[PDB]
Write a protein that binds this ligand. Structure first.
Ligand SMILES: Fc1cc(I)ccc1Nc1c(-c2nnc(NCCN3CCOCC3)o2)ccc(F)c1F
Ligand SMILES: Fc1cc(I)ccc1Nc1c(-c2nnc(NCCN3CCOCC3)o2)ccc(F)c1F
Ligand SMILES: Nc1ncnc2c1ncn2[C@@H]1O[C@H](COP(=O)(O)OP(=O)(O)OP(=O)(O)O)[C@@H](O)[C@H]1O
Ligand SMILES: Nc1ncnc2c1ncn2[C@@H]1O[C@H](COP(=O)(O)OP(=O)(O)OP(=O)(O)O)[C@@H](O)[C@H]1O
Ligand SMILES: [Mg+2]
Ligand SMILES: [Mg+2]
Lengths: 291, 303
């Protein structure tokens, strides 16, 4: 729903409530707005750029106001502060998908189906309605909440934000050199699903007995070498359904052309089956995260 | 600069200018209240915060015993809402990377003076303490209006390293291949650093004859920016970069080449380099580094 309740945001209007997370050039915090008692997450990006294009970075970030979908995280506002640029966004009380993976040892297919949908649609939104790819899809960038919503976060709307800036989710074609598009995010999403499926980052593909700690039946160049030159991870053909099996196996074909695309996936039998399934995802969330 | 205050309080600091950020750190121009001394403060926003964070500062303390005209000063370090703060000597000339932006490419005689301090600073940390730099690169070679060339961001604390982006790498071929960091690794980082400052750009995609003619035309012999894997896979498997012919002295040429031998065991060590005729020549030919630094940076100050 829409934040007409507020408007222009300055620094003072905010008050720290909690600490949400930290990343590579970014601290996020639960804060409250003065004018309207809205809990919104505040993204501090500590940076150094001339008093000239910091406006240009804010200007390019303003198209986020034009980004509205129940699968794209709500964007309240962005401004320049003495030290950092803030991005205030819809507060997702379920946090990140790896956060919830940190609690729940693995994430079940039924849920992963609901995730796949929400990402596929979210991806499609930015592509259809804004002509831009989500060049950083990963579990930490899929935000959930107690309302039962799964939403995408942290996409490169701003070209000059990108320029001014243990695991890797990047696609073969993105590492190898040229030829990179919306097929890259498919790979990203694919791996991300396989992660939450098995339980850990699956690029060293778990061995014959690795996953057995769940059921009955290292270097940075070395990593990049594996992704580029070695077979992709697969879901073990036991606990997961042939259709989920096939879904991720279609997302992790190295050749981007061979790899399935948005439409092929969105009409994949796994997605369709997931689309009509009844799952208390808001319930499963609260059963684990406790809120 | 052996300025003293010296027990540092968070609220004693005042944000003046932002200095930059990268690779897990945020450098800020700050002012100290009970001394009036403009220092640099680095925000390493480190996550985990138990007795390990307590070992980090305790390990960092050896930086008080770290004194050489070739190593950046250190006022102290403290815990401040998780994110640790290393407070260091403000180098008003900025990084060598900064001088490369304002200057064209750096003249090979000035690099000689730079080359002395990297080797000497490198050797100081190596011999007096037992740590190595793990991050030699233009942005980590700091200069000043007094004419000093110094070194920072070297790994004093083991814990801080184990506690913490590939736009363009300075890592040696053999390190990328997971054999642990040596002296020779810094040496490689120095070579590439030199070739960078000599030529005016990151050399790893090497300049083709045509491009070299646009740099210092036309004495010339032996577009897009490489992707992450593409880059490293180049650094490893492809031949090392070289200084162009007929522009820099044959001695400078052999110096940097000894620095950039892919085989780390065949690479020049600190002794070879310090006794190299390029470094010998560079010592006797006293050149006004302060005059050059200040005149190309419009920074002329009384030291
Ligand atoms: F916080 C947000 C909320 C929403 I809703 C949409 C975008 C963002 N943030 C970003 C971001 C962004 N948000 N978080 C990060 N973190 C850094 C991710 N990277 C890691 C390594 O290399 C490059 C980027 O980048 C980048 C570009 C851009 F145009 C944005 F709008
Ligand atoms: F800020 C400083 C000032 C001084 I004088 C000396 C060291 C540091 N900083 C560090 C640092 C440090 N300061 N900045 C970085 N950033 C680079 C991170 N990388 C480490 C290794 O390889 C690539 C990048 O690391 C690391 C370990 C350590 F023990 C330190 F004391
Ligand atoms: N709107 C939000 N609501 C709740 N939690 C959030 C929100 N945005 C981010 N977070 C949390 O804060 C953390 C930091 O996010 P940030 O994008 O700065 O880094 P990251 O996603 O962890 O990794 P990277 O630096 O690679 O992006 C995330 O892991 C996420 O759990
Ligand atoms: N003591 C200092 N005095 C003045 N400027 C400094 C000092 N230390 C760092 N800087 C500036 O801050 C900038 C960013 O420093 P920082 O070390 O965070 O990233 P970096 O220099 O790119 O190296 P790395 O990414 O490996 O940390 C540098 O370009 C340098 O100009
Ligand atoms: Mg993120
Ligand atoms: Mg540095």
């Amino acid at each position: 729903t829409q934040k007409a309740k507020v408007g222009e945001l300055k620094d003072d209007d905010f008050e720290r409530i909690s600490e949400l997370g930290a990343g590579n050039g970014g601290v996020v915090t639960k804060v409250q707005h003065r004018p309207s008692g809205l809990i919104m997450a505040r993204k501090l990006i500590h940076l150094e750029i001339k008093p000239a294009i910091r406006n240009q970075i804010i200007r390019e970030l303003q198209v986020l106001h034009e980004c509205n979908s129940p699968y794209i995280v709500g964007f309240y506002g962005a401004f320049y502060s003495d030290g950092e640029i803030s991005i205030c966004m819809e507060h997702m009380d379920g946090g990140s998908l790896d956060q919830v993976l940190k609690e729940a040892k693995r994430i079940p297919e039924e849920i992963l189906g609901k995730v796949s949908i929400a990402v596929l649609r979210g991806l499609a939104y930015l592509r259809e309605k804004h002509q831009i790819m989500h060049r950083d899809v990963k579990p930490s960038n899929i935000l959930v909440n107690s309302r039962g919503e799964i939403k995408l976060c942290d996409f490169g709307v701003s070209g000059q934000l990108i320029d001014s800036m243990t695991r890797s989710y990047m696609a073969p074609e993105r590492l190898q050199g040229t030829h990179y598009s919306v097929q890259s995010d498919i790979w990203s999403m694919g791996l991300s699903l396989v992660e939450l499926a098995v339980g850990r980052y699956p690029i060293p593909p778990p061995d014959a007995k690795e996953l057995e700690a769940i059921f009955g039946r290292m270097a940075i160049f070395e990593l990049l070498d594996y992704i580029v030159n070695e077979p992709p991870p697969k879901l073990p053909n036991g606990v997961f359904t042939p259709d989920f099996q096939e879904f991720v196996n279609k997302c992790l074909i190295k050749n981007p052309a061979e790899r399935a695309d948005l439409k092929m996936l969105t009409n994949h039998t796994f997605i369709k089956r997931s689309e009509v399934e009844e799952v208390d995802f808001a319930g499963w969330l609260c059963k684990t995260l406790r809120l």
